[PDB]
Enzyme design. Structure first.
Site, PDB file in Angstrom:
ATOM      1  N   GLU A 242       0.846  -1.184   0.000  1.00 23.36           N
ATOM      2  CA  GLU A 242       0.000   0.000   0.000  1.00 23.36           C
ATOM      3  C   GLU A 242       0.884   1.238   0.000  1.00 23.36           C
ATOM      4  OE1 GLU A 242      -2.662   0.183   3.274  1.00 23.36           O
ATOM      5  OE2 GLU A 242      -3.504   2.122   2.712  1.00 23.36           O
TER       6      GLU A 242
ATOM      7  N   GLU B  35      -9.795  11.454   5.070  1.00 19.34           N
ATOM      8  CA  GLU B  35      -9.581  10.392   6.041  1.00 19.34           C
ATOM      9  C   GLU B  35      -9.690  10.967   7.448  1.00 19.34           C
ATOM     10  OE1 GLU B  35      -5.936   8.386   5.289  1.00 19.34           O
ATOM     11  OE2 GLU B  35      -6.550   6.517   6.260  1.00 19.34           O
TER      12      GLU B  35
END
Ligand SMILES: *[C@@H]1O[C@H](CO)[C@@H](O[C@@H]2O[C@H](CO)[C@@H](O[C@@H]3O[C@H](CO[C@H]4O[C@H](CO[C@H]5O[C@H](CO)[C@@H](O)[C@H](O)[C@@H]5O[C@H]5O[C@H](CO)[C@@H](O)[C@H](O)[C@@H]5O)[C@@H](O)[C@H](O[C@H]5O[C@H](CO)[C@@H](O)[C@H](O)[C@@H]5O)[C@@H]4O)[C@@H](O)[C@H](O[C@H]4O[C@H](CO)[C@@H](O)[C@H](O)[C@@H]4O)[C@@H]3O)[C@H](O)[C@H]2NC(C)=O)[C@H](O)[C@H]1NC(C)=O
Ligand SMILES: *[C@@H]1O[C@H](CO)[C@@H](O[C@@H]2O[C@H](CO)[C@@H](O[C@@H]3O[C@H](CO[C@H]4O[C@H](CO)[C@@H](O)[C@H](O)[C@@H]4O)[C@@H](O)[C@H](O[C@H]4O[C@H](CO)[C@@H](O)[C@H](O)[C@@H]4O)[C@@H]3O)[C@H](O)[C@H]2NC(C)=O)[C@H](O)[C@H]1NC(C)=O
Ligand SMILES: *[C@@H]1O[C@H](CO)[C@@H](O[C@@H]2O[C@H](CO)[C@@H](O[C@@H]3O[C@H](CO)[C@@H](O)[C@H](O)[C@@H]3O)[C@H](O)[C@H]2NC(C)=O)[C@H](O)[C@H]1NC(C)=O
Ligand SMILES: *[C@@H]1O[C@H](CO)[C@@H](O[C@@H]2O[C@H](CO)[C@@H](O[C@@H]3O[C@H](CO)[C@@H](O)[C@H](O)[C@@H]3O)[C@H](O)[C@H]2NC(C)=O)[C@H](O)[C@H]1NC(C)=O
Ligand SMILES: *[C@@H]1O[C@H](CO)[C@@H](O[C@@H]2O[C@H](CO)[C@@H](O[C@@H]3O[C@H](CO)[C@@H](O)[C@H](O)[C@@H]3O)[C@H](O)[C@H]2NC(C)=O)[C@H](O)[C@H]1NC(C)=O
Ligand SMILES: *[C@@H]1O[C@H](CO)[C@@H](O[C@@H]2O[C@H](CO)[C@@H](O[C@@H]3O[C@H](CO)[C@@H](O)[C@H](O)[C@@H]3O)[C@H](O)[C@H]2NC(C)=O)[C@H](O)[C@H]1NC(C)=O
Ligand SMILES: *[C@@H]1O[C@H](CO)[C@@H](O[C@@H]2O[C@H](CO)[C@@H](O[C@@H]3O[C@H](CO)[C@@H](O)[C@H](O)[C@@H]3O)[C@H](O)[C@H]2NC(C)=O)[C@H](O)[C@H]1NC(C)=O
Ligand SMILES: *[C@@H]1O[C@H](CO)[C@@H](O[C@@H]2O[C@H](CO)[C@@H](O)[C@H](O)[C@H]2NC(C)=O)[C@H](O)[C@H]1NC(C)=O
Ligand SMILES: *[C@@H]1O[C@H](CO)[C@@H](O[C@@H]2O[C@H](CO)[C@@H](O)[C@H](O)[C@H]2NC(C)=O)[C@H](O)[C@H]1NC(C)=O
Ligand SMILES: *[C@@H]1O[C@H](CO)[C@@H](O)[C@H](O)[C@H]1NC(C)=O
Ligand SMILES: *[C@@H]1O[C@H](CO)[C@@H](O)[C@H](O)[C@H]1NC(C)=O
Ligand SMILES: *[C@@H]1O[C@H](CO)[C@@H](O)[C@H](O)[C@H]1NC(C)=O
Ligand SMILES: *[C@@H]1O[C@H](CO)[C@@H](O)[C@H](O)[C@H]1NC(C)=O
Ligand SMILES: *[C@@H]1O[C@H](CO)[C@@H](O)[C@H](O)[C@H]1NC(C)=O
Ligand SMILES: *[C@@H]1O[C@H](CO)[C@@H](O)[C@H](O)[C@H]1NC(C)=O
Ligand SMILES: *[C@@H]1O[C@H](CO)[C@@H](O)[C@H](O)[C@H]1NC(C)=O
Ligand SMILES: *[C@@H]1O[C@H](CO)[C@@H](O)[C@H](O)[C@H]1NC(C)=O
Ligand SMILES: *[C@@H]1O[C@H](CO)[C@@H](O)[C@H](O)[C@H]1NC(C)=O
Ligand SMILES: *[C@@H]1O[C@H](CO)[C@@H](O)[C@H](O)[C@H]1NC(C)=O
Ligand SMILES: *[C@@H]1O[C@H](CO)[C@@H](O)[C@H](O)[C@H]1NC(C)=O
Ligand SMILES: *[C@@H]1O[C@H](CO)[C@@H](O)[C@H](O)[C@H]1NC(C)=O
Ligand SMILES: *[C@@H]1O[C@H](CO)[C@@H](O)[C@H](O)[C@H]1NC(C)=O
Lengths: 176, 222, 906
Positions: free
Chosen positions: B117, B203
């Protein structure tokens, strides 16, 4: 599941370069939806059609565990091995064409047990042995071709072989 | 229009805009709703409003993002990933922690569990930071007149790399192939990995009467 | 105690700072908070009252993929100078006004400790730090600082600890300045540009002698041993060396051996070490920590162990994961003080044997992702193990009976191995929390004795073995499981009785068991926070409309292939997979409307749901697959079905629908549209070819579809299954069939259908494969082909009153594996070019009105298995081929003029 198991046993032993055996999986209840395998009513295998499919390997002894099979076609493939004796258990086979292929050994006498066979083409093969005597006992055999093979011994003519020609038995080490 | 569900989304052509309230239950008395405003070719524009309070105030509550659908290609076969993102943000009262981040997910195959990631943090508010095994940066990279510090961390069985900007970037325009090539050459990321997903969005951790507007966002894989 | 001026200075300092997370809550001017010493982070002298310590530092608490630290934002007040006896100052993780380090800190006059590390300070270090003569510990690491001159370090002659990492280090002669500190014991210079700043040998020659103990030289692009050679000048006194993340491409320098008193080596995250441990080691005699993770060593493990044999009695941690190391793990017990051994993700293809009886001090062992063979060793020789990971290996045999002698194990992962059994003494662990023994060939029965005393078990994972779990009645489980993954496990003919006491579980997957009992009375309410329910492939019977109660955390409900009966259960507001097929539910499904849902894949097939379909599908717009097949629904299809923008598979067949078909125009990304049976009427929808462009399967068979096949259907470009048999069509077969790509490729397997369940592994999604069936007319039999997308390529237009001729454009369709154009009023001749279709295994042109003679190219097939040209008005001679002559007389009959070897002769 017994016929599917037999066909899977045939698959594992042979090697496919063009990958024409990928659809044969054991999970299905019957092999009827498999490619190059023809069905009938009640889901019994009655044709195995594999022509110029580049397969390489050897024949499988439990191939004859299919009772309702006809028209076993495996010509023009790179199959090196010996013709199994279990093929005599086929009580309904009609056409067995195995030509342009490399199988070594003799022609089994149990092959003459076929009382409904009509076609028998074993051409351009390298089989070491002599013509079976019992094979002439079938009267439904309409055509036969054993040429370009390591054939030796006598040429039978009595009975069902009286309607054939020497061309069917040609290019052999010994014909007399 | 505007949708409020936990897993709902507003799919469009070549873009899918999620809500992604995957850690909603870790907050007490919060809500969030996203909406796509305008579409023009490859350009997109969306917005996200939310309010999260209390509970585990140290955890991400959502990742409302704008993901892109593309052909799953290996890293070595990617030529350029030009991306432009302009956004503005507006909070109301205080105790504000959030983040604006790009996610890249790569795996061994074109359809499999993520093994790598890649975060790209364009803004960090309220002390929100990237995941790090040691808590310290492991590299300093300047790409396209923009400084970045690199962090490395574990997340389950996945390795998370993070490029955190040094100054807040409300107007970003760069190429992701630069980051991917840096990771492959230096940090040891395999070049045979399949870039599974690309996405960009907010986020949040904690906020009150919070709204982020993406005036423009475009991306592509060549 | 608590001099008033000191308290006032602290309060004024707090005034500027903006706290949001409860820090400095004790600080205040209220009468109850008068005592200075009791405040958080403030320590005071006992005799006098002056403050000695001020540590307002934080720590990073980390979650899935983000860490957070409670920073202190504000302005550093200059009133701290009033705290004239302060000697410990720590302001580490807070981010104040991101500006210069305040200069007033130069005038504390008694500071023996300073730590501004990991804040957000920027700019040049103030030149006034030359007044900090009493400082022993200095830590300015990991800020946006620029260090280009170090002329101030000369005065700080009392330092034992200097850290300047994370800086834009541009000092050309840093070694010369550092050597002037006679009492320096460590030095942190990580992340600087030390690659471009190497000391010339003249500088080392002209330098005062100091003895270092710890060097933190990481994140410097050394890439060779010629750039960190200078540290070997400190070989007499070094104890800890850190060199991680340096892109070292070469052999580890042999001078690392002969570093006496070395106790901490960290060489992780390099490029390629090309061999690993040199033979120079074994002289160490004092090593306590060695890390070489992710370095590509390519070294024989027993050789590494022999080369570390100098420090068996002292070595404590040995990290050798993410490398390529082969061999076998032999005699790990000879390392007495070992406590961690990480050998993850290697190429270890060997055994795991002890072959000598001594006890081991190991606490964490990791051997996952290898190719290790042979039986497991006697685990009773590792009595202090806290974690044991042995997955993805090839271990075999029963798990040793000594596994019950651990009493400290917390995680046991032995999944994906060829293990054979489970011991009885496993139940005395009493501290296990996880048990992952899935995907092994395990046999036997797990009675209650195997689980007798596991009082702390939370996870049970025995997935996909030949195992059985038979617990006697009147057994009270000593645990409360949170995840219960027991598929393919014989959980008894009756419903398990130990689930009565099991509350507080998040997933419950007891599918593929042999439960042939009615749903018990007590099993009425699931735990309030259940996530995954999978009772599939059993014979459970009863009523489940009273079992689903709209829990907020539902994600998967799989009750398929059972004996459930009753009305449709409630659809939870957050469920994504709703599988209920192969059951005996009956009634209406109007209850799928009243609440919006996040469902993405629901399967109601093979049930007895009746009634008209509700017009409510705008409340469920996240759908990917929708299966309403093999039921007795009736009536027109709702218009709301056109609002399913995300739809990609519509399975609505073997029902009794009627009327025209609604406008599914804005339903892009639709790949499968199956509508067999269902008595649909009307002309073929013109929007199928105009809008649907990703379509791959189009099954509109056994319906009432009058009209003509408009050529627009050719624009699909991806069709591999076209089936319009028994539909009452008309017109000519389109001549535009060339445009169907994927019917020319000789051997191409299309990708299977895949949808997405998002939120499975927390932030990460999961990809699910839906291998839907397809009812086709294959080789004279109506059959349910399992995965049509991957293999099947058919065209079927039989019994639809099609008039005209066979298009000549079908000749180059190599990939077509079936063709049925029978029972039509077609005229013409068999197109010259069918012989080019290499993999055609099924041809049927019978009962047409064709003409001419059979083309010779048909002799080239060699794969055709079923043929039928009966009642077709042909003439001439059948071509001679091996496959053609192997067909019965019925396959060629019905032609008054045809003659060939199969039938008669010219
Ligand atoms: C100035 O101020 C600053 C403040 O900013 C000071 O800096 C701080 O200093 C403190 C010291 O007082 C630091 O705290 C200490 O941290 C260490 C490191 O902890 C982290 O690593 C641990 C080990 O990680 C390896 O191993 C694990 C598996 O065991 C693996 O998952 C890791 O990824 C890593 O693996 C690597 O190494 C392996 C072995 O070689 C390899 O196999 C592998 O491949 C890798 O190469 C880890 O256990 C630990 O985990 C904790 O944190 C995570 C995340 O938050 C959490 O999930 C866990 O549950 C743990 O809580 C960290 O990841 C740590 O070892 C120290 O522990 C001491 O304290 C505990 C307290 O209980 C004791 O029990 C211990 O015995 C021990 O005494 C300590 O916590 C702090 O990190 C540091 N901060 C910063 C920002 O620098 C600075 O010191 C000050 N200046 C001066 C001069 O003092
Ligand atoms: C509710 O519960 C049911 C049953 O418990 C689940 O249905 C099972 O789902 C699993 C997971 O998808 C299935 O397991 C998979 O089966 C595939 C097919 O196996 C056949 O084909 C292979 C290849 O030809 C043969 O080798 C095999 O013998 C079978 O003939 C496998 O290909 C899969 O293997 C993959 O995964 C495993 C494990 O990760 C890897 O080790 C492999 O290398 C490979 O990558 C896998 O084993 C299972 O078949 C399903 N059973 C039934 C009866 O359907 C439901 O999925 C569940 N509900 C939900 C919503 O998940
Ligand atoms: C056609 O001719 C062939 C030979 O040219 C015949 O094969 C032979 O048939 C006889 C039976 O008439 C066999 O004799 C038997 O032999 C066995 C031992 O093998 C013995 O136990 C019996 O008592 C009997 O004698 C003979 O073996 C067999 N083979 C040979 C090489 O002679 C075939 O039967 C003829 N077919 C007809 C007449 O239909
Ligand atoms: C708290 O405050 C007290 C008092 O200021 C501190 O005690 C002092 O400690 C120092 C260091 O030990 C003493 O200095 C020494 O004194 C002896 C005897 O006079 C002398 O022989 C030495 O050469 C040295 O000078 C000092 O005398 C002592 N104070 C008193 C009044 O005796 C104490 O250290 C402080 N606490 C902390 C944690 O700093
Ligand atoms: C699609 O979903 C929406 C929302 O999930 C459904 O709307 C909801 O319909 C129910 C039943 O009529 C409403 O409950 C009733 O509301 C009235 C007025 O508040 C109240 O007096 C009754 O006692 C009862 O509670 C509910 O309020 C309503 N919610 C919303 C947001 O409109 C809708 O019926 C579903 N189906 C269709 C075709 O839209
Ligand atoms: C063979 O299949 C292709 C699709 O792969 C067909 O090409 C498509 O033709 C239509 C014609 O109506 C194109 O639509 C047009 O699009 C433009 C731009 O959006 C628009 O301005 C026009 O008004 C019209 O709607 C479509 O874009 C095009 N698709 C592709 C991928 O080229 C073709 O018609 C099929 N038949 C043949 C070649 O005979
Ligand atoms: C191509 O599709 C047609 C239908 O669209 C298939 O026709 C079917 O052919 C079989 C075998 O000829 C028929 O079975 C028949 O059953 C009756 C008893 O009902 C029996 O008396 C006959 O002897 C025969 O076995 C079947 O009814 C027929 N389907 C119909 C008329 O709807 C054809 O098999 C397909 N071709 C291929 C190669 O699959
Ligand atoms: C380990 O240390 C010893 C000394 O303790 C090294 O031996 C030195 O080199 C050779 C050995 O062939 C001999 O001259 C002496 O044994 C030592 N020389 C001295 C003390 O001046 C030994 O070489 C070291 N190990 C390795 C692998 O180099
Ligand atoms: C389950 O484990 C517990 C551990 O706390 C056992 O309790 C004691 O165990 C020791 C030996 O392990 C015995 O000598 C004691 O007599 C046990 N105490 C009691 C009160 O019985 C407990 O015995 C274990 N369960 C069983 C069935 O033995
Ligand atoms: C497969 O068979 C074809 C004949 O059609 C031949 O040309 C080709 O070389 C064969 N492939 C291999 C790998 O032998
Ligand atoms: C495979 O079959 C082809 C077809 O004739 C043949 O030329 C080739 O030699 C065979 N390959 C072998 C026997 O390895
Ligand atoms: C199948 O053939 C083998 C080989 O001769 C034979 O032994 C066996 O008895 C046959 N099977 C049956 C059922 O007769
Ligand atoms: C058998 O081989 C000969 C040459 O050895 C060749 O002329 C003949 O065509 C082959 N048989 C067949 C059926 O191709
Ligand atoms: C630093 O030390 C010198 C030497 O005594 C002194 O004159 C100067 O005032 C000091 N600086 C500060 C800011 O106190
Ligand atoms: C070499 O060391 C002497 C020791 O006093 C020092 O004076 C001189 O400056 C040093 N050389 C250089 C170039 O600094
Ligand atoms: C430092 O190391 C170099 C290289 O081995 C050496 O030439 C030099 O004499 C050493 N200096 C001291 C003071 O040890
Ligand atoms: C119930 O489960 C939760 C996890 O969701 C856990 O934190 C809690 O300790 C459990 N309580 C009991 C009594 O098992
Ligand atoms: C369990 O069920 C399978 C098939 O579902 C069956 O073959 C097996 O005999 C059953 N075993 C028992 C013990 O009932
Ligand atoms: C469950 O259904 C199957 C087929 O629908 C049936 O054979 C079986 O008997 C049913 N179970 C019970 C317990 O009757
Ligand atoms: C559906 O209803 C019809 C008519 O009421 C009935 O004949 C049929 O059997 C029903 N379906 C099932 C699966 O029982
Ligand atoms: C085929 O049928 C159509 C419909 O009547 C007719 O016009 C056409 O002439 C026929 N084909 C031939 C070759 O006669
Ligand atoms: C295909 O058929 C033609 C005509 O009979 C023939 O000439 C050609 O050889 C055949 N193709 C192959 C590969 O044999």
């Amino acid at each position: 599941n017994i016929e599917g198991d037999a066909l899977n046993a045939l698959k594992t032993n042979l090697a496919d370069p063009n990958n024409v055996l990928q659809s044969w999986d054991p999970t299905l209840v019957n092999p009827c939806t498999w490619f190059h395998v023809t069905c009938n009513s009640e889901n019994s295998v009655t044709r195995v059609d594999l022509g110029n499919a580049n397969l390489s390997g050897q024949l499988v002894p439990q191939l004859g565990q299919l009772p309702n099979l006809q028209y076993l076609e495996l010509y023009s493939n790179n199959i090196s091995g010996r013709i199994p004796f279990e093929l005599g258990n086929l009580t309904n086979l009609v056409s067995l064409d195995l030509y342009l292929n490399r199988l070594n050994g003799p022609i089994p006498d149990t092959l003459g047990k076929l009382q409904k066979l009509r076609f028998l083409r074993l051409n351009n093969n390298s089989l070491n042995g002599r013509i079976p005597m019992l094979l002439t006992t079938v009267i439904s055999l309409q055509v036969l071709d054993l040429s370009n093979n390591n054939l030796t011994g006598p040429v039978p003519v009595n009975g069902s072989f009286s309607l054939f020609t020497p061309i069917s038995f040609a290019n052999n080490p010994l014909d007399i | 229009g505007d949708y409020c569900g936990q897993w709902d989304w507003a799919k469009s052509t070549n873009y899918i805009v999620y809500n992604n309230l995957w850690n909603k239950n870790a907050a007490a008395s919060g809500s969030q709703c996203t909406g796509v405003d305008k579409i023009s070719g490859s350009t997109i524009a969306w917005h996200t409003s939310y309010t999260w309070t209390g509970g585990a105030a140290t955890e991400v509550k959502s990742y409302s993002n704008a993901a892109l659908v593309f052909s799953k290609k290996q890293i070595k076969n990617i030529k350029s990933i030009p991306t432009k993102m302009k956004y503005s943000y507006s909070h109301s009262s205080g105790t504000f922690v959030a983040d604006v981040s790009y996610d890249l997910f790569t795996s061994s195959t074109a359809s499999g569990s993520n093994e790598y990631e890649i975060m790209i943090w364009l803004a960090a508010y309220g002390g929100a930071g990237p995941i790090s095994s040691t808590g310290k940066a492991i590299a300093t990279v300047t790409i396209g007149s923009n400084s970045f510090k690199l962090y490395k961390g574990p997340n389950g069985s996945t390795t998370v790399f993070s490029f955190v900007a040094t100054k807040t970037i409300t107007n970003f325009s760069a190429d992701l192939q630069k980051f991917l090539s840096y990771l492959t050459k230096n940090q040891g990321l395999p070049s045979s990995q399949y870039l599974i997903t690309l996405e960009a969005g907010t986020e949040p951790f904690v906020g009150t009467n919070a709204k982020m507007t993406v005036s423009s966002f475009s991306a592509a894989v060549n | 105690l608590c001099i008033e001026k000191e308290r006032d200075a602290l309060l004024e300092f707090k005034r500027g700072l903006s706290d949001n997370f409860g820090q400095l809550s004790t600080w205040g001017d209220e009468e109850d908070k008068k005592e200075c010493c009791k405040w958080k982070g403030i320590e005071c002298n006992k005799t006098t009252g002056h403050v000695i310590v001020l540590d307002l530092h934080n720590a990073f608490t980390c979650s899935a993929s983000a860490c957070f630290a409670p920073r202190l934002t504000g302005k550093l007040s200059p009133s701290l100078l009033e705290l004239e006896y302060l000697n410990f100052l720590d302001l580490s993780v807070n981010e104040f006004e991101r500006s210069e380090i305040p200069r007033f800190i130069c005038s504390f006059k008694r500071l023996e400790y300073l730590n501004l590390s990991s804040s957000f300070f920027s700019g040049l270090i103030p030149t006034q730090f030359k007044n900090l003569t009493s400082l022993r510990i200095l830590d300015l690491g990991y800020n946006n600082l620029i260090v280009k001159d170090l002329t101030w370090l000369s005065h700080l002659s009392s330092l034992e600890l200097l850290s300047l990492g994370g800086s834009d280090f541009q000092v050309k002669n840093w070694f010369q300045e550092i050597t002037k500190l006679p009492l320096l014991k460590e030095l942190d210079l990580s992340l600087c540009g030390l690659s471009k700043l190497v000391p010339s040998p003249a500088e080392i020659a002209n330098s005062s002698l100091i003895s270092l103990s710890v060097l933190h030289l990481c994140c410097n692009e050394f890439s060779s041993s010629a750039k960190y050679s200078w540290l070997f000048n400190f070989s007499t006194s070094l104890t800890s060396i850190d060199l991680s993340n340096n892109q070292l491409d070469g052999q580890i320098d042999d001078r690392f051996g002969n570093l006496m008193y070395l106790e901490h080596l960290n060489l992780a995250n390099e490029l390629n070490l090309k061999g690993g441990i040199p033979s120079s080691f074994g002289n160490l005699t004092r090593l306590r920590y060695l890390d070489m993770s992710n370095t590509r060593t390519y070294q024989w493990l027993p050789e590494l162990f022999v080369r570390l044999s100098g420090s068996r009695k002292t070595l404590e941690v040995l990290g050798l994961n993410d490398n390529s190391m082969f061999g076998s793990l032999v005699d790990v017990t000879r390392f007495s003080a070992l406590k961690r051994l990480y050998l993850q993700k290697n190429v270890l293809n060997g055994f795991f044997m002890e072959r000598f009886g001594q006890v081991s001090s190991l606490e964490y062992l990791d051997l996952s992702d290898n190719q290790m063979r042979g039986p497991l060793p006697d685990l009773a020789l590792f009595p202090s193990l806290r974690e044991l990971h042995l997955g993805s290996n090839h271990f075999n045999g029963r798990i040793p009976q000594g596994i019950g002698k651990l009493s400290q194990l917390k995680i046991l992962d032995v999944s994906s191995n060829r293990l054979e059994g489970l011991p009885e003494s496993m139940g005395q662990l009493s501290n296990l929390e996880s048990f992952d023994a899935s995907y092994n060939v395990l046999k036997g029965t797990i009675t209650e004795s195997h689980l007798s005393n596991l009082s702390s078990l939370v996870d049970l994972d025995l997935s996909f073995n030949s195992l059985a779990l038979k617990t006697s009645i009147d057994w009270l489980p000593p645990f409360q499981l949170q995840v219960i993954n027991l598929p393919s496990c014989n959980l008894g003919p009756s419903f398990p009785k130990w689930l009565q006491s099991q509350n507080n579980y998040t997933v419950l997957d007891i599918s593929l068991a042999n439960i042939s009992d009615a749903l018990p009375s007590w099993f009425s309410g699931l735990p309030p926070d259940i996530k995954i329910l999978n009772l599939s492939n059993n014979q459970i019977s009863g009523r489940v409309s009273d079992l689903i109660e709209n829990a907020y955390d539902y994600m998967v409900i799989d009750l398929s292939s059972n004996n459930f009966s009753g009305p449709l259960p409630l659809v939870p507001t957050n469920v994504q997979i709703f599988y209920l097929h192969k059951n005996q539910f009956f009634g209406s499904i109007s209850s799928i409307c009243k609440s919006t849902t996040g469902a993405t894949s629901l399967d109601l097939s093979h049930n007895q749901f009746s009634g008209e379909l509700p017009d409510c599908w705008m409340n469920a717009t996240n759908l990917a697959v929708l299966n309403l097949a093999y039921n007795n629904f009736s009536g027109k299809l709702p218009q709301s079905l056109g609002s399913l923008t995300n739809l990609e598979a519509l399975y609505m067949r073997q029902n009794s629908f009627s009327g025209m078909l609604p406008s599914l125009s804005q339903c892009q990304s639709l790949q499968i549209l199956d509508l067999g049976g269902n008595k649909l009427t009307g002309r073929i929808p013109a929007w199928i070819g105009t809008d649907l462009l990703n379509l791959r399967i189009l099954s509109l068979r056994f319906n009432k579809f009058y009209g003509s096949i408009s050529p627009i259907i050719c624009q699909l470009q991806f069709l591999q299954i076209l089936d319009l048999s028994a539909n009452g069509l008309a017109g000519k077969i389109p001549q535009c069939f060339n445009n169907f790509t994927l019917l020319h490729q000789e051997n191409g397997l299309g990708e299977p259908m895949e949808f997405l369940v998002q939120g499975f592994y927390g932030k990460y999604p999961r990809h699910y494969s839906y291998l839907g069936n397809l009812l086709v007319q294959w080789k004279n039999q109506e059959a349910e082909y399992k995965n049509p997308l991957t293999y099947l390529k058919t065209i079927d237009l039989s019994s639809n009153k099609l008039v005209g001729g066979i298009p000549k454009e079908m000749a180059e369709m190599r990939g077509l594996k079936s063709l049925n154009l029978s029972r039509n009023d077609l005229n013409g001749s068999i197109i010259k070019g069918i012989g080019q279709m290499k993999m055609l295994e099924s041809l049927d042109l019978s009962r047409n009105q064709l003409s001419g003679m059979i083309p010779k190219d048909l002799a080239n097939l060699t794969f055709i298995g079923v043929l039928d040209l009966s009642n077709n008005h042909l003439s001439g001679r059948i071509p001679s081929s091996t496959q053609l002559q192997t067909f019965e007389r019925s396959s060629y009959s019905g032609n008054a003029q045809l003659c060939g070897p199969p039938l008669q002769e010219c």
